Amino acid sequence: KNRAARVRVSKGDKPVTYEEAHAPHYIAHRKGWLSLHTGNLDGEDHAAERTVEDVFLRKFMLGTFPGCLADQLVLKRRANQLEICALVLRQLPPHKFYFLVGYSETLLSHFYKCPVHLHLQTVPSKVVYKYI
Amino acid sequence: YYVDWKMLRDVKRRKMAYEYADERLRINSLRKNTILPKDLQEVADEEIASLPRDSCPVRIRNRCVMTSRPRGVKRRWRLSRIVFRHLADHGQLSGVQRAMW
Amino acid sequence: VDVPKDMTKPEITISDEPDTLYKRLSVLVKGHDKAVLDSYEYFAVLAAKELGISIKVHEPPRKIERFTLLKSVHIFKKHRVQYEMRTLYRCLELEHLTGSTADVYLEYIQRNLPEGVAMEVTKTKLEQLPEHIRKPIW
Amino acid sequence: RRKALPPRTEKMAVDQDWPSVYPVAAPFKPSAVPLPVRMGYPVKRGVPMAKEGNLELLKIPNFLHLTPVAIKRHCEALKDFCTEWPAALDSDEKCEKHFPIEIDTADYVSAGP
Amino acid sequence: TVDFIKKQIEEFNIGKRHLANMMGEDPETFTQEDIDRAIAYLFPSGLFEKRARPIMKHPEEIFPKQRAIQWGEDGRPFHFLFYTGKQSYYSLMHDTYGKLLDVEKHHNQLRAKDLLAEKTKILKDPIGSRWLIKEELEEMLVEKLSDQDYAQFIRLLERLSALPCGATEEDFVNRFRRSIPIQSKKQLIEPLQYDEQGMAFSRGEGKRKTAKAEVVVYGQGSGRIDVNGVDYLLYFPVTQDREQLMFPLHFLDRLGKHDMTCAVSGGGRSAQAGAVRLAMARALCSFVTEDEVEWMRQAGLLTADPRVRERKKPGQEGARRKFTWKKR
Amino acid sequence: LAYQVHGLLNTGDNWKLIGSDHRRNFYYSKFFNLLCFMEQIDVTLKWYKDLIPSVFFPHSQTMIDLLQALDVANRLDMVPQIWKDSKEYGHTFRNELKEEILMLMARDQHPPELQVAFADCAADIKSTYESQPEWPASSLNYVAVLFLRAGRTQEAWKMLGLFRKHN
Amino acid sequence: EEVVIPKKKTWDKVAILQALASTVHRDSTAAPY
Ligand SMILES: [Mg+2]
Ligand SMILES: [Mg+2]
Ligand SMILES: [Mg+2]
């Protein structure tokens, strides 16, 4: 059987996001891409760099916002600037949320040598597509 | 930490080979030419073989960037097929998709 | 109700120099998904009709790159996974433009380029003749 | 202490000019957008998911800053920077008779550092 | 779930006003079409599945039909057939059988009075009339059905329509009529074209197997064919290919009467012969009578040949051919 | 001359012309203080929705001004709205300016259409201070009178009951 | 003689961005940017 990026059927109680509810053969058909950048187009360069950046960004954002991260990150790259769009549970007081917004934006702007935008969309609890 | 000792050894190889690139190019210019006398190219041969062993480009290995895998690498992402597929199958590689035709 | 008064302060100067002429300007937008290139072509054509730049648009044939990997971690070579990359094209062909209009239109357009698309600009510019060639002979 | 504030769509006037809300390229916050929009695959009985908490609408490039009214206004503000094209040059014949030489130059834009 | 639909319609109207405002259009003349263009522009999702794309539509179209409340606040069900567990379907059957009984009674009274005044309306066949599918019936009653249920119902309708038809009865069985759309396979004749004092030239375009052919035929000329600027005897050295070019002309007995020029690209020699054959056949349909067009279609001249190279598959050799399979 | 000062601010650079946030809210406190009483309700209700939630948020001084602006022009329609906004911005000031807010409910005469507005606005209030908040008898004058113009005796009874339970 | 050329308008880098910022006024229902 194909195990790739699949959430196996449970006893029927298992809450599932729209994201996790669709296997790899459904990309570009039903679910879209979690990253947007030019580097994978036909005549273009530095796909490798954008990829390693991507990975580090997911890992980093997951570690910087413990427990409040709802869905997988959305990374949009436009003309040297990267906008990170995130779905975030309401856990921390807005004080901590802003603290980490600024801290992260600054830190990654100085790390990757480009302007970093961070857009937080807050949601009460994980949005459920299926089962449950 | 580079994921493996092997990855470390290859980072050192790429640094050394980047450093001596000029020397090697200039000497192998003499060595690869018919116009110059043989007496010059023999001394130039001993000169380029004198150079540190780890500075020559044929000892460099393209390895998976994340996982260190010595082969089964897609050069464009510098990724092992395994790691590549992992990333692509989660929708994390823009424009990449399963192929139906 | 509340209207800020005297909000405009543009800065433009006119140099005495003979502004560069462009016989034809081709803008080629490569993209992954079609709909984005459609709304972008609509936006670009509208922005060109508002500046009276007189443009045509056509669609260059799409390019699909396919490649094959092993499905298994260790050993089954009979089994593979096949992956695609689809690059789609829009070509905006503008004709009879000046240098200033070219830089304004290209600035406006390039600011509004979507994250997943790339753009190639081929400008064919008009120059009369070089000085040493005009009608001297050596 | 838990704080839930009703979305912008409540205070939104029916005729309020749109380009005021989305001046620049934006992520699509669902609170700031008045239109109900259901995207995502449906379920057998059910409908496509709402606009709130929907990640798929977040993935989409949105042309909301580029709404045709905003293009009219923008381009009317850009009419000042553009310089006119010479009359007599209207046909390619006179283009060749006057300027013999074409210099082709390529400029590329790609996202990244 | 009623408050839900009320709210959804409120916010759909408000949102349609907003969308009409930003798109710069009259909120009154805004249609579903315009809504579609609007969201297609504002949220441009390339996705191959069209049901996964952004949608703002009237809540009645989006949400599925709801079974209404089946009883009063005292608990007593509204309909008398409620406890059947299918009230809609068995109501339908009760009334259908009631009307079949009615037809039998009325028509028997008219048998005793020496009157058969009715006619058979049972043949609607030129209208292309058919019954509902099970899906349509299922949608009409807002209730799930079984194959035997639908078959039962339909059979009872056949019992009804096979008798003398009343007015109310005809109108009744005509809810359950659908009309199959236009059935004609007749081709669309290329209007003949007169160009630069030259008379009667027709065009046709064949496509076969990586090979495209554009054929212009003149009815005013003698027999010859020029393919890519050269004679057909030169371009097609193989006899088979010239016979392929000869097929439609010999079929219509036009062999000496027409003069043709062709542009054919891609594929091999036989693929080109076939593409030109098809193009030529489609070009000769302007010069001939409407009957011989049907004759050419029935000889297989006018249909493109769908047969095309299949893609090689991984783990196999030839897209069919498999690697050698070892038992032990 | 305040229209004039505002025309001056917005002109060269409006943003560069005010240094701090305290000295910024002074500006709108006093400016809207003028706008509310000195101008017709058509102007005040208008500049209201533009200045208050968007730029800088109401203090107690701008809180009392709306109250005195709706008593003179006889506006009973805008009480639920301004109350719902003052709830959002004005949580701490509540106890002190409340007695002032409610006093404008006596001054009016109440048609059969406005009953439910009074009912809701007062019920949220008194369900807030009975679940915790010294509560004035004025508020009961209001619930009871507004419920007399409403035609509802039964709730006014339970509210008089809830004040005589307040010792 | 029929040949006519206009002159070039040299503007500052940020100029077009500020000319676009002119066509957008301030949003009423919006919180601080
Ligand atoms: Mg290890
Ligand atoms: Mg090697
Ligand atoms: Mg074979």
Domain assignments of chain C as residue spans, ordered by start: 10-138
Which tokens sit at E298?
Answer: 């029935």
Contacts of C38 in chain E (CB under 8 A): 40, 44
Nearest chain D CA: its distance from E47 CA (Å) = 10
Taking the CA atoms of G9, G12, G16 and G18 in sequence, report the sign of the dihedral they define.
negative
> Using the beta-carbon criterion (under 8 Å), do F10 and C1 form an inter-chain contact?
no
Fold designation for B1-91: Helix Hairpins (1.10.287)
E229 — phi, psi (to 5°)? Answer: 80, 0
Contacts of G6 in chain D (CB under 8 A): 83-84, 86
> Using the beta-carbon criterion (under 8 Å), do D81 and G24 form an inter-chain contact?
no
Distance CA E105, CA F22 (A): 93
Nearest chain D CA: its distance from G2 CA (Å) = 6
Q: Do chains E and G touch (3 or more CB pairs under 8 A)?
A: no
List of residues 6+ apart from C122 with CB closer than 8 A: C25, C26, C28, D104, D105, D106
Contacts of E54 in chain D (CB under 8 A): 37-39, 57, 60
How close is the Cα of E188 to the center of ligand 3, in Å? 40
Q: Which residue of F has its CA nearest to C9?
A: F12
Nearest chain D CA: its distance from C119 CA (Å) = 5
Q: Do chains C and B touch (3 or more CB pairs under 8 A)?
A: yes
> Using the beta-carbon criterion (under 8 Å), do E41 and C42 form an inter-chain contact?
yes
Burial code of E199-211, b = ≥16 C-beta within 10 A, e = fewer?
ebbbebebbbbeb
Contacts of C70 in chain B (CB under 8 A): 72, 81
> Using the beta-carbon criterion (under 8 Å), do E46 and C32 form an inter-chain contact?
yes
> Using the beta-carbon criterion (under 8 Å), do D110 and A18 form an inter-chain contact?
no
> Using the beta-carbon criterion (under 8 Å), do D35 and E54 form an inter-chain contact?
no
Distance CA A80, CA A112 (A): 10
| Beta strands, E only, chain E | 129-131, 177-179, 193-195, 198-208, 211-218, 224-227, 230-231, 259-265
Which tokens sit at A31?
Answer: 């679910």
Burial code of B58-93, b = ≥16 C-beta within 10 A, e = fewer?
eeeeebbbbbbbeeebbebbbbbbbbbbbbbbbbbb
Which tokens sit at E228?
Answer: 């890519």
CB atoms inside a 10 Å sphere around CB C86: 21
Residue of C67, C73, C85 with shortest CB distance to B95: C85
**Helix axis angle, F94-102 to F138-150, nearest 10°:** 40
Contact at 8 Å (CB) between B77 and C66? Answer: no
Contacts of A30 in chain E (CB under 8 A): 47, 49, 52
| Beta strands, E only, chain A | 35-36, 74-78, 81-89, 116-123
How close is the Cα of E208 to the center of ligand 3, in Å? 21
Distance CA A19, CA D56 (A): 8
List of residues 6+ apart from F13 with CB closer than 8 A: none
- Least Cα distance to D62 among C36, A108, E56, E177 occurs for C36
Chain A residues within 8 Å of chain E (Cβ atoms): 28-32
Q: If contacts are CB pairs under 8 Å, which of residues 55-74 in chain D contact chain C?
A: 61, 63, 65-66, 68, 71-72, 74
Nearest chain B CA: its distance from C81 CA (Å) = 8
Distance CA E207, CA E302 (A): 11
> Using the beta-carbon criterion (under 8 Å), do A29 and E45 form an inter-chain contact?
no
How close is the Cα of B68 to the center of ligand 1, in Å? 9
Nearest chain D CA: its distance from A13 CA (Å) = 16
Between the alpha carbon of residue C91 and those of residues C21, C57, D66, D98, the distances in Å are 21, 6, 20, 28
Q: Distance between the two ends of chain G, CA-based, in angstroms?
A: 55
Residue of C46, C98, C118 with shortest CB distance to D71: C46
Contact at 8 Å (CB) between A71 and A110? Answer: no
User: Parallel, antiparallel, or unpaired for β E198-208 and E211-218?
Assistant: antiparallel
Contact at 8 Å (CB) between E251 and E296? Answer: yes
Residue type, B47: E
Between the alpha carbon of residue E226 and those of residues A101, B91, E232, E233, E238, the distances in Å are 73, 54, 6, 9, 16
Contacts of A51 in chain C (CB under 8 A): none
Distance CA D28, CA D7 (A): 13
Beta bridge partners of C15: G8
Nearest chain A CA: its distance from C119 CA (Å) = 9
* SS3 (DSSP) at C128: coil
Which tokens sit at F146?
Answer: 């507004």
Whether F14 contacts chain C with CB within 8 A: yes
Q: Which of C1, C93, C108 is the mutation pick for testing D, counting most D CBs within 10 A?
A: C108
Beta bridge partners of E227: E230, E262
Tell me what percent of chain B is helix, strand and coil, each rounded to the nearest 5. Answer: 55, 5, 40
Q: Do chains F and G touch (3 or more CB pairs under 8 A)?
A: yes
Ligand nearest to the CA of E322: 3
Contact at 8 Å (CB) between E229 and E282? Answer: no
Q: Rounded to the nearest 5 degrees, what angle is found at the Cα of E321, between the Cα atoms of E320 and E325?
A: 125
List of residues 6+ apart from B83 with CB closer than 8 A: B64, B66, B67, B69
Which tokens sit at E153?
Answer: 């119902």
Distance CA F29, CA E260 (A): 90
Taking the CA atoms of F65, F67, F68 and F69 in sequence, report the sign of the dihedral they define.
positive
Contacts of E24 in chain D (CB under 8 A): 67-69, 72
Q: Do chains B and G touch (3 or more CB pairs under 8 A)?
A: no
Q: Do chains A and E touch (3 or more CB pairs under 8 A)?
A: yes
**Tokens 């209208």, residue?**
E127
Chain G residues within 8 Å of chain D (Cβ atoms): 2-9, 11, 15-16, 19-30
Nearest chain C CA: its distance from B6 CA (Å) = 21
Q: Which residue of D has its CA nearest to G7?
A: D83
CB pairs under 8 A between A and E: 13
Residue of C36, C80, C82 with shortest CB distance to E44: C36
Contacts of F87 in chain D (CB under 8 A): none
Nearest chain E CA: its distance from C99 CA (Å) = 30
> Using the beta-carbon criterion (under 8 Å), do D56 and A18 form an inter-chain contact?
yes
Distance CA A51, CA E7 (A): 44
Burial code of C20-33, b = ≥16 C-beta within 10 A, e = fewer?
bbbbbbbbbbbbbb
Give the rounded distance of the alpha carbon of A21 from its chain centre.
Answer: 16
How close is the Cα of B65 to the center of ligand 1, in Å? 14
Give the experimental resolution in Å.
Answer: 3.2
List the determination method: cryo-EM
